[PDB]
Design a protein around this ligand. Structure first.
Ligand SMILES: *[C@@]1(O)O[C@H](CO)[C@]2(O[C@@]3(O[C@H](CO)[C@@]4(O[C@]5(O[C@H](CO)[C@@H](O)[C@]6(O[C@@]7(O[C@H](CO)[C@@H](O)[C@H](O)[C@@H]7O)O6)[C@@H]5O)O4)[C@H](O)[C@H]3NC(C)=O)O2)[C@H](O)[C@H]1NC(C)=O
Ligand SMILES: *[C@@]1(O)O[C@H](CO)[C@]2(O[C@@]3(O[C@H](CO)[C@@]4(O[C@]5(O[C@H](CO)[C@@H](O)[C@]6(O[C@@]7(O[C@H](CO)[C@@H](O)[C@H](O)[C@@H]7O)O6)[C@@H]5O)O4)[C@H](O)[C@H]3NC(C)=O)O2)[C@H](O)[C@H]1NC(C)=O
Ligand SMILES: CC(=O)N[C@@H]1[C@@H](O)[C@H](O[C@]2(O)O[C@H](CO)[C@]3(O[C@@]4(O[C@H](CO)[C@@H](O)[C@H](O)[C@@H]4O)O3)[C@H](O)[C@H]2NC(C)=O)[C@@H](CO)O[C@H]1O
Ligand SMILES: CC(=O)N[C@H]1[C@H](O)O[C@H](CO)[C@]2(O[C@@]3(O[C@H](CO)[C@]4(O[C@@]5(O[C@H](CO)[C@@H](O)[C@H](O)[C@@H]5O)O4)[C@H](O)[C@H]3NC(C)=O)O2)[C@@H]1O
Ligand SMILES: *[C@@]1(O)O[C@H](CO)[C@]2(O[C@@]3(O[C@H](CO)[C@@H](O)[C@H](O)[C@H]3NC(C)=O)O2)[C@H](O)[C@H]1NC(C)=O
Ligand SMILES: CC(=O)N[C@H]1[C@H](O)O[C@H](CO)[C@]2(O[C@@]3(O[C@H](CO)[C@@H](O)[C@H](O)[C@H]3NC(C)=O)O2)[C@@H]1O
Ligand SMILES: CC(=O)N[C@H]1[C@H](O)O[C@H](CO)[C@]2(O[C@@]3(O[C@H](CO)[C@@H](O)[C@H](O)[C@H]3NC(C)=O)O2)[C@@H]1O
Ligand SMILES: CC(=O)N[C@H]1[C@H](O)O[C@H](CO)[C@]2(O[C@@]3(O[C@H](CO)[C@@H](O)[C@H](O)[C@H]3NC(C)=O)O2)[C@@H]1O
Ligand SMILES: CC(=O)N[C@H]1[C@H](O)O[C@H](CO)[C@]2(O[C@@]3(O[C@H](CO)[C@@H](O)[C@H](O)[C@H]3NC(C)=O)O2)[C@@H]1O
Ligand SMILES: CC(=O)N[C@H]1[C@H](O)O[C@H](CO)[C@]2(O[C@@]3(O[C@H](CO)[C@@H](O)[C@H](O)[C@H]3NC(C)=O)O2)[C@@H]1O
Ligand SMILES: CC(=O)N[C@H]1[C@H](O)O[C@H](CO)[C@]2(O[C@@]3(O[C@H](CO)[C@@H](O)[C@H](O)[C@H]3NC(C)=O)O2)[C@@H]1O
Ligand code: NAG
Ligand code: NAG
Ligand code: NAG
Ligand code: NAG
Lengths: 413, 193, 371, 99, 49
């Protein structure tokens, strides 16, 4: 109070020294059950894959994708992502998600990347230069090699494939001047070969299953978003909370108000969130702003003593010598008395505090005045037999200081 | 064969809940006392549309929404069926599938906002036939699909009223429960103004 | 509770200590208003156990112990007539509780009933209520015998007049217009102040966490600055509205204090200050945010035409009325008090003699009986 | 930069002059009350109760203060009351006598 | 009477409504002032001819 009054001596009175707000603890977040999940399982654990010339594309839509299952798995040889962070898209959404799966061999996995050339990159599967997505591959010798699957790849093509183009035509490739008649011959070759996936092949010659996730993020609606962590709730404790994207700080409590089956969160008046239903358990809670109020000291004046009695306004002080609850707040450091005296320092709610003897600050319900019942009767009169003349002082302000402010010299100078 | 749209034809604007308070909402609504075109075919979709139908034998089936409906561009094809209601972006009536959804007076409100299709429905114990009595009801049981096209056709496959929503503010009174007991139309009348 | 906004606000200056100082000033001014209006009684006066106030009936305006609030019937009616913690807004409770104000008014009412106006001057000196009403009739110009001869009728009129107030308050709606208007104005101000938060104020979004989240701090600073300046402007507007309205209510509270003093504590000769008609007495009742005065006034009725004369010319000298007015019913001349027709024989005792006949114009010959 | 400074200093000067106007209105109310007291309590004797001191007003004197005025109100306060039996009238010879 | 300005003004909030309400309050107060000062007589009185 000496600080906020800019003095080393403060007079007898009650001064609002500061404000006090209970700080929130253990913030909580909640989001509805993850009932619908994205079909990455039927893409990655598909019993049969597809030849690289006829690569399979799976469109991912209207689902929540938990990409952590992909990068937390320890059964991948390569997980190269371009222009996107797989560890950072579990709180991200995409306007479009594609999943391309096929089978190649070891030394050809390096071709599934932007700006590559070769049999696979030019005639089977081409990625764009500005590719945004991940290239995931793993050895599949235990599945695609026996001593009965038949995987194919394209040998020739009259022009290189555009990015994400797919050619499945089995027409005879014309390499020379003479035109083939849909039949193989001189300067005429069938465009597809089979892979020679033998279990005893070298590592670079064994089959590798490849999945290519590609993403798009335009200023357009999105339907593929990852999962959202959720935690348990609390009661009667000022907490920062996140309910279905709505952030707020308060004490959550049980509420008798019933929502309607469609209403999520409610506002009593003045566009202030007052109730909210949790998405998991489908239960309504009332939000109350956790206790806050001005803290004001009561001091009898410095020269009298240095004692003070703190008053935390409108705070039921179950929380931070003798702690006395009053209808104007909580009083810390002031003894409560039963008798009543004339009001000295106005606390509020019909309660005043004063410094009196040993030498303590006492709070009491102020006395309106002395009580007397003047003796009325239908035939009794009280006549004055004497008098006192009395001079009293009435003080009245009549004027102020005639201040004049030069606008320009004050503003600019 | 027009017929004035009465008070009926108002829906819950958003998900929020309001108890015993009056609110003002600014979005598409069906005007009070606006002569809807009772049909007894072909219907446009300039904007969101209030569709209200009465069938003793439930003859009417789902709505075939379409921007062009020439098989060139994707349709919406709401249909309904004893077991379930099926809606696909792609039976007897026909004309690159993007999305399919299957789930479970007769007020119906359909609108497309920023590519999101919204449906509002209500069931009423009608006692007078061939007139929709002025009364109040609304709900928001909906299915949202991000089409992003401007539908222009209905082709509903035994008479149905059809009215067109307009962007005019309303004042909705809210019950203690949170339901919309009543509403008034701001620009309808100077008294309502 | 946003730290970066806290810093950007800090750099503006001492605006908020100033706003807080203005608001706390009007806050303590309100307590001063209530205490000044009601705390004009030195010591609370208990009313006697048995009510025999000369036929007058004060049961309605006197406190009833049966009620838990311990306030009078009309005060509870007035309380029922009116119909009276979100983000940084707090409403401090008034220093004087409603029960304390009811006790103040009960003390004032018991004092004015039992002791008349003596208790305001000093020690409470008790007079029988009939004799005090006679004092007050002498105050308004009517002689005191008029009350005693008509005491039962006056008691019945006062009782029925108090009864009419109960009907007027209970049935007629919007009787407490001014007080309800005060409550509505304060609710309106707080409500619009809270509504201003949703306003965009020219930034990309109103909600501050969102504007913080999806922009870099250098760019977000500008949008946050727009939000801060708009919200600070709205809060400054609310504070200045409160200051002006508090000035107006202070004027009304000073008027209530003056009426409490000049009408409850004492009889006032200022015409139309307290009621319509010559003022007899007034009683205070505690409304929720104000005081309701019941003004007991004396209004004359059933007037009669008379022929009057300025002076009576008898035996060559002019007799003027001491306190009355000469009136003639057609053949005889009488002296009557102006406010109440009570004729008396013209005598030298009640008519003083000055001058002679010729000077004064309009005088009429008659005989002044000499006792 | 000067624009920001101008706006801030202008807002401060504006709120200062508004608070000065309100304080001046309060002081004008007080000065009108003081003029009424000086006219009704010094230039004469006032019957309106508790306007000038507690008790029946005899007279009053003004004294100059730095920014105001201090009235010394001389009032008559009855004291040493005595009980008596009382009656409104007196019956004598079949006539009522009132004081 | 420019829509582009009015749409920007909508963002500021209820300032115009507040100003209109304050001014209309002053307006009705002026009628109240004249009524309180001059309408002290119940019924119009005519001086005798
Ligand atoms: C009227 O109603 O009230 C006034 C009050 O001012 C009253 O006048 C007071 O009378 C007192 C009684 O005589 C007076 O007290 C004494 O004064 C003499 C001086 O004349 C003084 O020597 C006296 O003290 C001695 O006696 C007392 C008591 O025995 C004792 O305690 C002392 O130690 C000392 O031995 O002292 C008294 O003080 O008292 C007051 O001076 C006097 N006041 C004034 C201002 O003159 O006046 C009226 O008598 C009274 N009238 C009626 C009809 O009741
Ligand atoms: C009031 O109640 O009493 C007085 C007192 O008597 C009354 O005054 C009287 O007024 C008369 C009208 O002026 C007065 O009559 C004349 O006075 C003059 C003045 O001396 C006198 O010369 C006059 O007589 C002549 O004229 C009359 C006709 O007027 C004629 O018959 C005579 O024979 C003669 O030729 O005489 C009148 O006497 O009349 C009275 O003298 C005068 N009385 C006195 C004592 O001065 O004053 C008032 O008239 C009367 N007012 C009312 C309303 O009754
Ligand atoms: C207490 C008492 O008896 N006072 C009377 C007083 O009433 C009376 O003056 C009227 O009282 O004034 C009215 C004016 O409204 C007056 O009446 C007129 O009547 C004619 C037709 O008769 C109408 O055409 C006029 O428009 C007007 O209404 O009535 C007339 O002067 C009085 N009315 C009465 C007596 O009924 C005065 C008269 O001098 O006498 C007082 O003693
Ligand atoms: C949660 C809540 O209060 N919901 C309220 C809903 O929003 O509004 C309706 C209608 O205004 C409200 O319904 C009525 O509530 C009362 C009290 O809860 C209900 O009163 C009881 O009814 C039961 C049987 O239902 C009796 O056994 C009991 O004695 C009470 O009489 O009163 C009343 O029945 C409800 N009306 C119904 C169910 O139609 O509904 C509802 O509270
Ligand atoms: C205080 O002045 O008055 C209290 C009145 O309630 C007093 O509290 C009571 O004290 C008695 C005796 O100790 C107990 O039997 C009661 O249970 C108790 N009641 C309550 C509500 O606390 O309290 C209190 O003792 C008294 N204190 C003093 C110092 O006089
Ligand atoms: C909307 C929804 O599906 N909510 C369920 C959520 O997804 O999963 C929890 C987990 O079981 C679910 O909680 C169960 O709810 C039922 C409803 O009455 C209770 O009977 C169960 O006890 C409860 N079980 C648990 C573990 O919470 O919760 C939600 O219903
Ligand atoms: C002038 C007057 O009314 N005097 C009455 C006084 O005010 O009250 C007493 C009360 O005792 C009154 O005298 C009577 O007292 C008996 C006592 O039992 C009552 O029963 C009588 O009702 C009462 N008389 C009246 C008229 O009330 O004395 C005085 O009369
Ligand atoms: C009489 C009947 O049930 N008719 C069809 C009903 O209206 O809709 C469902 C759509 O789900 C229909 O069944 C589907 O038939 C196709 C074709 O064989 C199957 O691929 C779907 O799995 C199957 N769906 C369901 C839910 O059964 O059935 C009915 O034919
Ligand atoms: C002495 C006396 O009779 N005082 C009455 C007082 O002046 O008015 C109240 C209110 O009417 C009066 O109390 C009511 O009296 C009637 C009898 O006519 C009873 O029926 C009522 O119950 C009673 N109370 C109320 C609240 O009306 O009280 C006093 O009698
Ligand atoms: C026109 C008229 O009747 N005037 C009367 C006047 O207004 O009052 C007096 C005094 O009462 C009145 O005269 C008295 O009337 C009473 C009526 O009861 C008679 O008993 C008296 O005899 C009569 N005369 C007197 C008292 O001298 O006169 C007028 O009649
Ligand atoms: C000035 C004076 O002496 N007044 C008294 C008055 O004349 O009589 C009444 C009743 O006798 C009196 O009031 C009672 O006085 C005694 C003794 O002082 C007290 O004990 C009583 O409490 C008091 N009140 C009663 C009896 O109701 O009152 C006056 O003091
Ligand atoms: C003040 O409270 O204490 C001073 C000693 O520190 C003392 O000199 C001074 O008189 C005191 N003031 C009052 C008003 O008593
Ligand atoms: C207090 O605020 O909280 C206690 C536990 O939460 C409760 O028992 C007590 O009654 C409350 N008191 C008040 C005055 O609110
Ligand atoms: C091996 C198995 O049983 N299931 C796999 C799972 O391990 C893998 O995480 C998932 C990827 O979507 O693909 C499934 O087929
Ligand atoms: C020719 C044509 O429109 N092809 C579209 C393609 O553009 C779109 O990206 C894809 C989304 O599933 O659906 C195809 O039918």
């Amino acid at each position: 109070t000496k600080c906020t009054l800019k003095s080393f001596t403060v007079e007898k009175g009650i001064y609002q020294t500061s404000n006090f707000r209970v700080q929130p603890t253990e913030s909580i977040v909640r989001f509805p059950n993850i009932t619908n999940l994205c079909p990455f399982g039927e893409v990655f654990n598909a019993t049969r894959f597809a030849s690289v010339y006829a690569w399979n594309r799976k469109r991912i839509s209207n689902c929540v994708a938990d990409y952590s299952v992909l990068y937390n798995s320890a059964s991948f040889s390569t997980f190269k992502c371009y222009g996107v962070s797989p560890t950072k898209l579990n709180d991200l959404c995409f306007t479009n998600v594609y999943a391309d799966s096929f089978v190649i061999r070891g030394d050809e996995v390096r071709q599934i990347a932007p700006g590559q050339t070769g049999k696979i990159a030019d005639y089977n599967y081409k990625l764009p230069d500005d590719f945004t997505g991940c290239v995931i591959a793993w050895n599949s010798n235990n599945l695609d090699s026996k001593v009965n699957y038949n995987y194919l790849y394209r040998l020739f093509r009259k022009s290189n494939l555009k990015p994400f183009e797919r050619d499945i035509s089995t027409e005879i490739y014309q390499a020379g001047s003479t035109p083939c008649n849909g039949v193989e011959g001189f300067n005429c070759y069938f465009p597809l070969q089979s892979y020679g996936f033998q279990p005893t092949n070298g590592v670079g010659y064994q089959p590798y299953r490849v999945v290519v996730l590609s993403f798009e993020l335009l200023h357009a609606p999105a339907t593929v978003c990852g999962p959202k962590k959720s935690t348990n709730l609390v009661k009667n404790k000022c907490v920062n909370f996140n309910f279905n994207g709505l952030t707020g700080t308060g004490v959550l409590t049980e509420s008798n108000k019933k929502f309607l089956p469609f209403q999520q969160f409610g506002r009593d008046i003045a566009d202030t969130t007052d109730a909210v239903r949790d998405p998991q358990t489908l239960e309504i809670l009332d939000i109350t702003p956790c206790s806050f109020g001005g803290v004001s000291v009561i001091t009898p004046g410095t020269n009298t003593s240095n004692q003070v009695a703190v008053l935390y306004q409108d705070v039921n002080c179950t929380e931070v010598s003798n702690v006395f609850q009053t209808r104007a707040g909580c009083l810390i450091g002031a003894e409560h008395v039963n008798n009543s005296y004339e009001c000295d320092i106005p606390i509020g709610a019909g309660i005043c505090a004063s410094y009196q003897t040993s030498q303590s600050i006492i709070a009491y319900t102020m006395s309106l005045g002395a009580e007397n019942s003047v003796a009325y009767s239908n035939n009794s009169i009280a006549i004055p037999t004497n008098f006192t003349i009395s001079v009293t002082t009435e003080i009245l302000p009549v004027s102020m200081t005639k201040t004049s402010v030069d606008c320009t010299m004050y503003i600019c100078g | 064969a027009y017929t004035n749209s009465f008070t009926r034809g108002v829906y819950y604007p958003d998900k929020v809940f309001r108890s015993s308070v009056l609110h003002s909402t600014q979005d598409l609504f069906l005007p009070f006392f606006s002569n809807v075109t009772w049909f007894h075919p072909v219907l446009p979709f300039n904007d969101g549309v209030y569709f209200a139908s009465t069938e003793k034998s439930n003859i009417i089936r789902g709505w075939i929404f379409g921007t062009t409906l020439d098989s060139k561009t994707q349709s919406l094809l709401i249909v309904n069926n004893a077991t379930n209601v099926v809606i696909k972006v792609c039976f007897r009536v026909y004309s690159n599938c993007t999305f399919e959804y299957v789930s479970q007076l007769r007020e119906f409100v359909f609108k497309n906002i920023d590519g999101y299709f919204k449906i509002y429905s209500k069931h009423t114990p009608i006692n007078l036939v061939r007139d929709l009595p002025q009364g109040f009801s609304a709900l928001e049981p909906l299915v949202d699909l991000p089409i992003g096209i401007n539908i222009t056709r209905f082709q509903t496959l035994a008479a149905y009223y059809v009215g067109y929503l307009q962007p005019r503010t309303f004042l909705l009174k809210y019950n203690e429960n949170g339901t919309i007991t009543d509403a008034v139309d701001c620009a309808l009348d100077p008294l309502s103004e | 509770d946003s730290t970066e906004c806290s810093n950007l606000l800090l750099q503006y200056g001492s605006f908020c200590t100033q706003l807080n100082r203005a608001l706390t000033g009007i806050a303590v001014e309100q307590d001063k208003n209530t205490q000044e209006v009601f705390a004009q009684v030195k010591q609370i006066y208990k009313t006697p156990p048995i009510k025999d106030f000369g036929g007058f009936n004060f049961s309605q305006i006197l406190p009833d112990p049966s009620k838990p609030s311990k306030r009078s019937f009309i005060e509870d009616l007035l309380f029922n007539k009116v119909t009276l913690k979100f983000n940084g807004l707090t409403v401090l409770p008034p220093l004087l509780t409603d029960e304390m104000i009811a006790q103040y008014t009960s003390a004032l009412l018991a004092g004015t009933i039992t002791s008349g106006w003596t208790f305001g001057a000093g020690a409470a000196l008790q007079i029988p209520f009939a004799m005090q009403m006679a004092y007050r009739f002498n105050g308004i110009g009517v002689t005191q015998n008029v009350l005693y001869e008509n005491q039962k009728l006056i008691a019945n009129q006062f009782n029925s007049a108090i009864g009419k107030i109960q009907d007027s308050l209970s049935s007629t709606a919007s009787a407490l217009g001014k007080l309800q208007d005060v409550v509505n104005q304060n609710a309106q101000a707080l409500n619009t102040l809270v509504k201003q938060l949703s306003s965009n104020f020219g930034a990309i979004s109103s909600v501050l966490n969102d504007i913080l989240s999806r922009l870099d701090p250098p760019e977000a600073e500008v949008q946050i600055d727009r939000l801060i300046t708009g919200r600070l402007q709205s809060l400054q507007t609310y504070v200045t509205q409160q200051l002006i309205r508090a000035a107006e209510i202070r004027a009304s509270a000073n008027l209530a204090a003056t009426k409490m003093s000049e009408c409850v504590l004492g009889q006032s000769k200022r015409v139309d200050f307290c009621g319509k008609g010559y003022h007899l007495m007034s009683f205070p009742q505690s409304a929720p945010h104000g005081v309701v005065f019941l003004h007991v006034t004396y209004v004359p009725a059933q007037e009669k035409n008379f022929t009057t004369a300025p002076a009576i010319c008898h035996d060559g000298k002019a007799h003027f009325p001491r306190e009355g007015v000469f009136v003639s019913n057609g053949t005889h001349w009488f002296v009557t008090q102006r406010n109440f027709y009570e004729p008396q024989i013209i005598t030298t005792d009640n008519t003083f003699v000055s001058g002679n006949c010729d000077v004064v114009i309009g005088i009429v010959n008659n005989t002044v009986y000499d006792p």
